Amino acid sequence: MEPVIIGALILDVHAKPSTTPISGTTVPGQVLFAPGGVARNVADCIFKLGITPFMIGTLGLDGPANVLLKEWKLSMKGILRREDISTPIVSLVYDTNGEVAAGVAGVDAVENFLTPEWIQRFEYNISSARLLMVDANLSSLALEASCKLAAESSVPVWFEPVSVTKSQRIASIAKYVTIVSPNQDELIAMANALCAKNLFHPFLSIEDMFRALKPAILVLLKNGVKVVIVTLGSNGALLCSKGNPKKALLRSGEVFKRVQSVCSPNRFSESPSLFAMHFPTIPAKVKKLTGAGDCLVGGTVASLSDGLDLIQSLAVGIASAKAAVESDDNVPPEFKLDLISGDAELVYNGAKMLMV
Amino acid sequence: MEPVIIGALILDVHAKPSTTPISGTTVPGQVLFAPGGVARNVADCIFKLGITPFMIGTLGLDGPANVLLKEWKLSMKGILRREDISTPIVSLVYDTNGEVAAGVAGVDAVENFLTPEWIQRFEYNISSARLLMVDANLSSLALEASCKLAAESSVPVWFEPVSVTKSQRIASIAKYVTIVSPNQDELIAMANALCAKNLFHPFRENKLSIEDMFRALKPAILVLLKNGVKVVIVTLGSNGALLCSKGNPKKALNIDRVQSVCSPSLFAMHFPTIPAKVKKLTGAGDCLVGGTVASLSDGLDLIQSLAVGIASAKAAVESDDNVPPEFKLDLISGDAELVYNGAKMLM
Ligand SMILES: Nc1ncnc2c1ncn2[C@@H]1O[C@H](COP(=O)(O)OP(=O)(O)O)[C@@H](O)[C@H]1O
Ligand SMILES: Nc1ncnc2c1ncn2[C@@H]1O[C@H](COP(=O)(O)OP(=O)(O)O)[C@@H](O)[C@H]1O
Ligand SMILES: O=c1[nH]cc([C@@H]2O[C@H](CO)[C@@H](O)[C@H]2O)c(=O)[nH]1
Ligand SMILES: O=c1[nH]cc([C@@H]2O[C@H](CO)[C@@H](O)[C@H]2O)c(=O)[nH]1
Ligand code: NA
Numbered sequence: 031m032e033p034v035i036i037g038a039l040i041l042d043v044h045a046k047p048s049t050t051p052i053s054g055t056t057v058p059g060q061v062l063f064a065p066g067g068v069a070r071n072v073a074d075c076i077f078k079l080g081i082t083p084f085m086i087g088t089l090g091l092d093g094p095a096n097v098l099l100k101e102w103k104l105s106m107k108g109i110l111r112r113e114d115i116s117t118p119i120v121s122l123v124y125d126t127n128g129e130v131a132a133g134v135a136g137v138d139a140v141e142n143f144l145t146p147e148w149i150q151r152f153e154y155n156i157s158s159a160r161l162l163m164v165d166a167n168l169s170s171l172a173l174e175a176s177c178k179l180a181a182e183s184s185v186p187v188w189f190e191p192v193s194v195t196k197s198q199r200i201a202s203i204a205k206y207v208t209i210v211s212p213n214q215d216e217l218i219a220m221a222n223a224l225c226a227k228n229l230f231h232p233f234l235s236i237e238d239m240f241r242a243l244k245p246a247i248l249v250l251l252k253n254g255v256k257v258v259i260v261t262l263g264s265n266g267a268l269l270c271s272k273g274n275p276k277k278a279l280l281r282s283g284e285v286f287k288r289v290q291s292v293c294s295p296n297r298f299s300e301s302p303s304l305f306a307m308h309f310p311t312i313p314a315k316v317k318k319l320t321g322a323g324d325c326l327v328g329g330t331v332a333s334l335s336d337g338l339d340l341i342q343s344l345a346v347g348i349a350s351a352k353a354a355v356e357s358d359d360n361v362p363p364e365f366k367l368d369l370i371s372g373d374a375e376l377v378y379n380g381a382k383m384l385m386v
Numbered sequence: 387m388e389p390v391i392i393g394a395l396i397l398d399v400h401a402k403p404s405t406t407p408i409s410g411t412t413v414p415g416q417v418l419f420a421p422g423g424v425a426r427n428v429a430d431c432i433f434k435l436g437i438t439p440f441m442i443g444t445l446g447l448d449g450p451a452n453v454l455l456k457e458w459k460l461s462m463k464g465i466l467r468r469e470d471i472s473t474p475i476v477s478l479v480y481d482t483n484g485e486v487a488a489g490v491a492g493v494d495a496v497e498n499f500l501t502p503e504w505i506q507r508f509e510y511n512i513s514s515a516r517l518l519m520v521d522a523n524l525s526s527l528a529l530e531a532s533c534k535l536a537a538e539s540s541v542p543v544w545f546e547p548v549s550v551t552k553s554q555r556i557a558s559i560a561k562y563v564t565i566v567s568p569n570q571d572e573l574i575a576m577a578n579a580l581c582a583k584n585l586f587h588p589f590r591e592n593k594l595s596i597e598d599m600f601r602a603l604k605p606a607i608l609v610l611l612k613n614g615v616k617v618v619i620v621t622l623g624s625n626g627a628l629l630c631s632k633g634n635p636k637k638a639l640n641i642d643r644v645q646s647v648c649s650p651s652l653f654a655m656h657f658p659t660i661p662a663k664v665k666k667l668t669g670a671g672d673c674l675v676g677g678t679v680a681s682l683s684d685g686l687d688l689i690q691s692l693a694v695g696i697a698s699a700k701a702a703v704e705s706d707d708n709v710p711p712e713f714k715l716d717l718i719s720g721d722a723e724l725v726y727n728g729a730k731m732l733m
């Protein structure tokens with residue numbers, strides 16, 4: 031009853047310039063390949079926490095595909111591969127402080143070839159899934175078909191917004207989506223999509239940052255999303271939900287055990303239209319920020335798959351995202367459950383109710 | 387006794403966004419890979435014209451190498467590959483109107499790993515080569531090591547200046563070098579590099595008659611020749627190329643179709659190019675070199691060879707890649723005749 035992950039496998043090109051990138055010209059720097067794609071990163075993170083996901087995606091029969099699959103240890107039954115498909119490539123240029131200065135995504139293969147017809151071959155996997163995660167590299171039609179199959183079996187759906195542009199694909203499926211995980215910029219675009227208007231604009235205290243984002247969050251909840259997680263980079267994450275967050279969504283494995291013992295379900299005092307809490311992250315030595323949000327998703331889905339409640343699960347997601355930033359890859363080579371559970375407790379014990 | 391090409395194999399990444407790139411996020415667009423590296427491009431043109439070159443270079447045992455080598459169908463014997471080497475990549479992000487908005491080049495592996503020590507492994511190939519082509523991605527020590535092995539066997543050396551910056555590496559090897567192929571800016575940098583003072587100023591504004599551009603550049607050209615360079619080919623983009631030499635330019639290689647159609651002490655000649663609908667300009671110069679080296683390799687004189695080089699570069703600009711998928715030798719010999727019959731003596 032594995033979680034099912036649907037979306038892009040992408041070959042990332044990461045260009046870290048040694049000096050400030052200058053318009054019109056090339057500067058020296060470090061340029062590397064890394065396995066990427068939001069759905070792939072999530073699946074990867076889940077796997078490394080000891081849960082086996084089922085990946086549905088598409089790849090070429092080309093060089094970049096060979097790179098992505100070199101260390102692939104998951105099933106490939108769900109991956110559509112054909113000679114006429116061009117493996118997706120993302121090109122990132124960072125600034126000197128590790129933020130994306132410019133990024134271009136060539137993900138045509140996912141929009142054109144990762145179709146409802148392809149996804150429906152795996153109707154069984156989806157209906158029996160503990161949870162379905164779809165990323166926004168999917169076409170609207172692929173998203174709709176996916177979410178409906180999930181709903182028909184009341185399988186909870188996680189929508190990953192991917193980027194400011196693609197996040198607006200929440201629009202055609204919001205009533206089917208259980209959880210979304212945007213950053214501040216994607217949240218705004220998603221709210222504008224669901225209002226069918228450019229009402230909200232992009233951009234300090236945690237409290238003011240929440241008050242700032244609250245209307246946007248409400249637009250998402252009013253349109254049927256049950257849980258909104260807003261990731262705030264080095265400031266952690268907001269958890270907002272329709273009603274009690276624990277009550278918004280085989281026997282447990284080891285991830286459950288350690289975390290269940292130290293992140294007690296009886297930690298928080300005591301339903302409400304808007305529930306909001308802030309989760310801190312942990313001091314980290316940053317090597318590469320890219321993909322941390324994806325590991326937050328994977329860590330959260332892993333914990334949920336293993337039976338943890340949502341609040342305990344997000345604490346693990348944040349621990350996982352910390353491990354990810356402290357690595358030079360999108361997803362760490364490995365996870366130390368020692369540090370993961372320890373950090374999760376740190377995050378969990380530091381969490382604060384917002385509307386008090 | 388194949389020509390030996392030593393230099394960079396680089397993976398070019400071209401990212402063309404559908405909307406204005408926004409910081410903090412990715413926008414949809416097209417991202418393309420293309421085989422690059424000046425010396426690799428040169429070998430590529432040589433091979434596609436039917437001459438088999440020998441490549442000496444360096445790559446990682448990594449992902450970009452895997453992609454880069456997907457269509458490589460030459461020997462790998464001369465290529466140093468190690469797990470600790472990061473394959474060179476140049477990554478460009480364009481704006482919506484097709485000009486470069488941001489670029490990063492990580493091509494240090496060539497200088498750090500393509501060492502004299504590696505190059506000396508192929509002393510046999512270099513000494514028996516009909517021609518040695520080195521690009522300026524090589525470290526100075528690597529350039530010196532390469533050029534000395536050639537000179538000692540009187541193998542002619544072609545130096546590709548690569549860029550305004552790297553063109554300055556000519557300074558310690560100029561006496562070993564037979565031919566250089568700078569564009570207008572690289573020529574200026576090379577002359578300032580060899581000169582006692584930075585006398586020459588770069589081009590800034592209105593374009594000049596070709597005979598007036600030669601007089602402008604002639605002192606710089608003289609600096610190179612006086613420092614031991616035998617032949618200076620200055621490429622002039624849409625205006626073709628200048629060929630200047632010590633003594634008569636009708637020089638062949640000491641070795642033993644176009645010849646069918648192109649009938650055979652400071653000399654200067656202008657070679658016109660051919661009207662072309664440009665698709666991507668980048669790397670055309672590398673095919674001028676490869677086309678010329680191919681022709682020289684097949685026994686043509688320099689004047690016939692440069693005409694082919696210009697034909698080859700015209701085909702290059704009319705393609706989306708650095709080097710065309712193939713060469714239609716029908717069309718090349720045809721363009722070559724045009725260029726050759728169009729060549730003009732200045733001095
Ligand atoms: N500098 C950091 N130190 C510690 N944790 C971080 C840092 N940056 C990001 N994280 C963790 O990664 C998560 C995702 O970060 P964010 O940048 O908001 O998402 P995205 O990767 O989608 O842009 C954050 O919620 C936080 O939990
Ligand atoms: N518009 C064009 N049409 C035909 N040939 C061209 C055109 N532009 C450039 N070339 C060929 O490319 C060669 C090198 O171009 P140039 O811009 O001078 O060097 P680089 O490519 O090194 O910058 C020229 O000598 C010319 O033969
Ligand atoms: O349009 C897209 N942009 C960026 C990504 C992925 O985001 C990853 C980091 O979160 C990154 O690996 C990139 O491939 C994508 O899948 N689609
Ligand atoms: O430092 C360098 N930058 C770019 C190139 C190559 O020049 C090619 C075009 O002439 C292009 O393929 C690029 O890779 C190089 O060889 N050294
Ligand atoms: Na990282």
Ligand code: NA
Binds near residue numbers: 708
């Ligand atoms: Na071209």
